[PDB]
Design a protein around this ligand. Structure first.
Ligand code: PER
Ligand code: PER
Ligand code: PER
Ligand code: PER
Ligand code: PER
Ligand code: PER
Ligand code: PER
Ligand code: PER
Ligand code: PER
Ligand code: PER
Ligand code: PER
Ligand code: PER
Ligand code: PER
Ligand code: PER
Ligand code: PER
Ligand code: FE
Ligand code: FE
Ligand code: FE
Ligand code: FE
Ligand code: FE
Ligand code: FE
Ligand code: FE
Ligand code: FE
Ligand code: FE
Ligand code: FE
Ligand code: FE
Ligand code: FE
Ligand code: FE
Ligand code: FE
Ligand code: FE
Ligand code: FE
Ligand code: FE
Ligand code: FE
Ligand code: FE
Ligand code: FE
Lengths: 173, 173, 173, 173, 173
């Protein structure tokens, strides 16, 4: 590139990798979102919560692609693997899957930041600090809170608690 | 003081004492407030309720300090003792601690009013009547009401009741 | 914590420590603020300046506590030591104490950032960069400016200069 | 009186006495106010400050007279003694006279409250608490502050300090 | 130039020269402006006054360059010499340097006008009359006024006068 300056080929490759991980995360949330809209699951606030995450992950990979072009790297795309489950169980099972996905993304971001640090790329380090690291921390905190309220609502009266959590914590209608 | 008139040195000292008690109460509510924001407690309306009390106790000690200066006494500060617990249990345990704290503050206010009465200081007596005694009575009544609704929600289905009380009585989002 | 990821127990402890330092700084500014409101000191712009700093330090420790909870650490509180003086002298003595306090806080922030760097915690490093380091630098610059104008106003005509500085530099009525 | 209930003849008399003291205080502030408007004194902010006090003392005696009629006592007026000085010196001499006057009024209010207490007249006690005691405390605190700023401005450069205090503390034009 | 008409090569060269003098004057005011913002000088109204002059000199050289192009001359730039001092002393020393700089610019403008007159270039003569000569006269008059008020404020109480002049004559906050 006539513009490329201080941008390691290893960072360029790891940015492409992280774009595939966001594409795959977005597709997982797509599937979670539709699953909760099934007539035999029918938790619209849960569905909305995951659809909005599919959108947020989408903005993540678009931001990464834009930055790849601003630095003079070249986007390379790979096949996007289907989500790990076809059916996602009850609200607490889905939320625990989402939390494990966000931990995996957060560790990928932290590995990419360590890589950019090792290549002394402060533009890369600040881009991740600014647009990604704090957003992940807030989201994981929010999922932890939701798992804790789902657990206080669980036990023998679990169907009732699931109905209440969807109605009084999550956003709907 | 060139301004000091009818202001006993014993009232001045007891005002300093009561400022330390408010500082300590404010710090207790700080700790309650953050405890309820932990990802493994996650009751935002409970957290909000205690954070607002930390603020209200803050206004109490600032009002006492301003009055100390208006009467020509001298503020003297002491170390502020840490709150009595590091972890505050469930909503009803926290609310019972808060109620015991407000009883202790209310008795301190009532002892300071008896002292000002014994020193025939009607400015002091009216300052406490106006800014403190009725606010404590209202708050204790409100905590009594909350304890009564927590008790009707307790028993075997306690986690559910705690989730409902936070959602439908306390203020959040 | 079900949410804790890449958050060292040493950072968690040093965040608790820094919260105690902010609590103590806030309490120092409380005392400075009331001291300047005494009828025999009576510099309302000086009092306002320190009261606003008590508030700003308050926002600092609340921000640190919120971040401790977002990362999945646990707030632990200790006794808050009383301020180092009961009487704070004239404006330039108070401002030199405030400056020494802000230097000590700034060095604590810089030590916590070096610690987070040594534990490769970029969320921590960016949190301090964003919310604390530049605010301290600006405040210390402002205190340096105030000390320089107090010094040009000092000497034999010191009472006059102190009255003018409070009236024409500091905010009041 | 067909309306008089629980209103001691000694309180009625002491209310008449206190009305004469307010009339005399108002007349002292009248004289202070015009003195500072003399072409050879010419401190308009000082003049304004005392004229406003003449008005405030006026509202005091009118409030006392209205209350005398509400309780069914009978206003009795006596000759109003002229102010203690024809010329009031410099700002700090005038402010020290005003402060001594407000101390004397404050002690009269405190003696009337002790009297109403000894006659178990809680309407009287609350009337003084509500309309007089806190207003006196605030005013004396304000005069103490002004005396302290006048003192920091005094010494060999006293004419200059007096000009600055009038311009930058007191209200004018 | 296909447009050049009645534009002497000596005027073109002297316009390039005068552009270098304005660049150098602008850079002097830059340095004055930052010097007065140092924590150990701290006179914000003085700093503002010189920063605005850096801007005004900037508009001067841009106006000269635009006019050079309108007449069909060719801008030629030379190295811009650093300002004559690294530290500018107190307000009156800085203002006397600024005044000497404006005298030198004013004499350069007057020499360029005499040159354009000798080449019978009335477009040049009117351009300088309209955009430069009266602006210099007003500015020098204003600097003379400031030097006179600084001198009435000088002597043994010089630090005080400097603080007052910055606060009550110059623009700040
Ligand atoms: O949600 O945009
Ligand atoms: O839209 O973020
Ligand atoms: O939604 O950002
Ligand atoms: O709540 O103010
Ligand atoms: O704010 O009370
Ligand atoms: O909130 O008062
Ligand atoms: O100051 O908020
Ligand atoms: O409020 O910062
Ligand atoms: O005040 O931020
Ligand atoms: O002043 O009414
Ligand atoms: O009018 O008080
Ligand atoms: O003026 O009340
Ligand atoms: O100043 O434009
Ligand atoms: O802008 O002149
Ligand atoms: O500023 O022209
Ligand atoms: Fe959306
Ligand atoms: Fe969104
Ligand atoms: Fe978004
Ligand atoms: Fe969006
Ligand atoms: Fe609030
Ligand atoms: Fe409040
Ligand atoms: Fe309040
Ligand atoms: Fe409030
Ligand atoms: Fe504020
Ligand atoms: Fe603030
Ligand atoms: Fe703030
Ligand atoms: Fe604020
Ligand atoms: Fe009036
Ligand atoms: Fe009035
Ligand atoms: Fe009034
Ligand atoms: Fe009035
Ligand atoms: Fe400008
Ligand atoms: Fe300009
Ligand atoms: Fe301009
Ligand atoms: Fe301009």
């Amino acid at each position: 590139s006539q513009i490329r300056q201080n941008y390691s080929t290893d960072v360029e490759a790891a940015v492409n990798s992280l774009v595939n991980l966001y594409l795959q995360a977005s597709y997982t949330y797509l599937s979670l979102g539709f699953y909760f809209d099934r007539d035999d699951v029918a938790l619209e606030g849960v569905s909305h919560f995951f659809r909005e995450l599919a959108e947020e992950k989408r903005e993540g990979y678009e931001r990464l692609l834009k930055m790849q072009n601003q630095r003079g790297g070249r986007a390379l795309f790979q096949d996007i693997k289907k989500p790990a489950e076809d059916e996602w169980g009850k609200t607490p099972d889905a939320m625990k899957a989402a939390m494990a996905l966000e931990k995996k993304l957060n560790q990928a971001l932290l590995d990419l930041h360590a890589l950019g640090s090792a290549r002394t790329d402060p533009h890369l380090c600040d881009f991740l600090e600014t647009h990604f690291l704090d957003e992940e921390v807030k989201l994981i905190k929010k999922m932890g809170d939701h798992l804790t309220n789902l657990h206080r609502l669980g036990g023998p009266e679990a169907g009732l608690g699931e109905y209440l959590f969807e109605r009084l914590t999550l956003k709907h209608d």
